[PDB]
Amino acid sequence: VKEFLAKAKEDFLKKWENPAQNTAHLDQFERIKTLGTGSFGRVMLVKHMETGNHYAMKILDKQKVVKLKQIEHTLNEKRILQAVNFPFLVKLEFSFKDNSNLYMVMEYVPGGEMFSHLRRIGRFSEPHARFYAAQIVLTFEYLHSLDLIYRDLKPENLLIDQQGYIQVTDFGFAKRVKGRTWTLCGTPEYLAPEIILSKGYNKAVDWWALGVLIYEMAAGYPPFFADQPIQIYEKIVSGKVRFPSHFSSDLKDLLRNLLQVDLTKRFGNLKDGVNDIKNHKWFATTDWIAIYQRKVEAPFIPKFKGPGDTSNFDDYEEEEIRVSINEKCGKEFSEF
Amino acid sequence: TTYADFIASGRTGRRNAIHD
Ligand SMILES: Nc1ncc(Cc2ccccc2)s1
Numbered sequence: 001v002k003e004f005l006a007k008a009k010e011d012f013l014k015k016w017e018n019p020a021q022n023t024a025h026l027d028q029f030e031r032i033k034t035l036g037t038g039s040f041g042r043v044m045l046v047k048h049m050e051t052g053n054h055y056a057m058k059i060l061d062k063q064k065v066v067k068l069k070q071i072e073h074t075l076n077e078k079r080i081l082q083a084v085n086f087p088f089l090v091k092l093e094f095s096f097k098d099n100s101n102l103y104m105v106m107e108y109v110p111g112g113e114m115f116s117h118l119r120r121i122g123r124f125s126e127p128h129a130r131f132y133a134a135q136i137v138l139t140f141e142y143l144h145s146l147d148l149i150y151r152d153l154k155p156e157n158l159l160i161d162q163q164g165y166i167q168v169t170d171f172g173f174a175k176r177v178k179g180r181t182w183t184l185c186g187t188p189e190y191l192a193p194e195i196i197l198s199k200g201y202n203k204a205v206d207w208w209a210l211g212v213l214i215y216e217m218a219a220g221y222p223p224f225f226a227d228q229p230i231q232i233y234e235k236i237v238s239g240k241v242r243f244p245s246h247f248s249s250d251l252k253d254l255l256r257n258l259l260q261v262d263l264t265k266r267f268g269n270l271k272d273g274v275n276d277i278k279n280h281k282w283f284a285t286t287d288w289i290a291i292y293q294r295k296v297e298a299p300f301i302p303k304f305k306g307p308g309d310t311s312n313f314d315d316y317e318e319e320e321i322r323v324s325i326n327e328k329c330g331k332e333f334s335e336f
Numbered sequence: 337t338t339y340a341d342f343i344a345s346g347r348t349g350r351r352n353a354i355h356d
Contacts, residue, residue, distance in 0.1 A: 154351060187354065
């Protein structure tokens with residue numbers, strides 16, 4: 001583990017300090033369908049012509065990123081992704097830019113989001129939820145060892161692969177920080193109290209978000225919901241959680257320690273760090289090595305119909321890609 | 337029920353990130 005993480009960091013740091021740039025070009029890909037949208041572009045299913053490999057290409061309109069003041073966040077995202085390498089993180093295959101846009105070509109993960117299956121089925125059994133929770137526990141131990149805070153855990157951002165294992169996507173808010181940080185970002189249901197209250201905060205916000213996730217998986221709804229974000233915030237800072245009567249007592253206790261307002265008491269945030277979580281009774285049946293190596297059988301394998309099938313994703317209205325004749329925001333994105 | 341209160345709320349679709 002220590003020795004895993006030592007090698008992981010050496011590996012990461014080389015790429016961190018010398019980021020890969022300009023490793024493909026748009027005209028090498030055949031565009032097929034939109035798998036998702038966002039405030040600065042979309043993710044499209046695409047085909048790499050030279051190989052016949054399918055990928056998910058994220059396109060960001062440089063002008064939109066600038067307007068929304070997300071330049072630094074966007075350079076974080078690319079610089080981190082090109083440098084990390086973990087089984088439960090979607091791989092960045094290529095990245096490039098043109099006059100108008102930024103492009104991040106990711107590994108295509110055809111099983112769709114946990115969100116979809118979670119909403120459809122209603123809720124996951126404790127074993128089913130424990131299985132995905134353990135993959136996140138290891139993923140955060142990997143990312144936090146690298147000084148990386150993730151900051152957007154939610155079922156919408158966890159993709160299910162062909163083996164029924166999770167792949168974390170969307171690094172738009174990930175940041176390499178040694179001390180504390182202040183940006184208000186993330187998703188309302190998943191924000192730790194520190195964030196809402198404009199305190200400086202650190203990685204402990206990822207562990208809190210883990211408690212929100214685990215609870216959502218196992219209850220079928222989040223511990224703090226309302227029709228408007230400000231009503232959600234009050235619920236979160238009051239730190240009053242009710243559990244479904246079906247919740248096992250081990251689960252209720254883990255959740256009490258994860259969704260802990262007092263940072264000297266929050267699991268992940270103490271002298272033993274991540275082992276508080278890994279050693280908790282709820283996880284007693286978890287074989288950590290076998291999860292990492294993917295030899296545990298998944299509770300659920302997605303229905304697969306083809307290499308480039310898209311039915312596990314919602315439909316989205318297409319929009320043509322226009323590339324301007326003039327370079328936009330060149331200086332802002334020169335390191336991209 | 338809490339489930340019923342959830343299902344009837346405006347937040348059962350995909351949830352957008354906030355920032356600033
Ligand atoms: N690698 C990817 N496969 C499908 C994707 C669309 C998507 C992207 C982000 C969050 C949810 C869904 S990204």
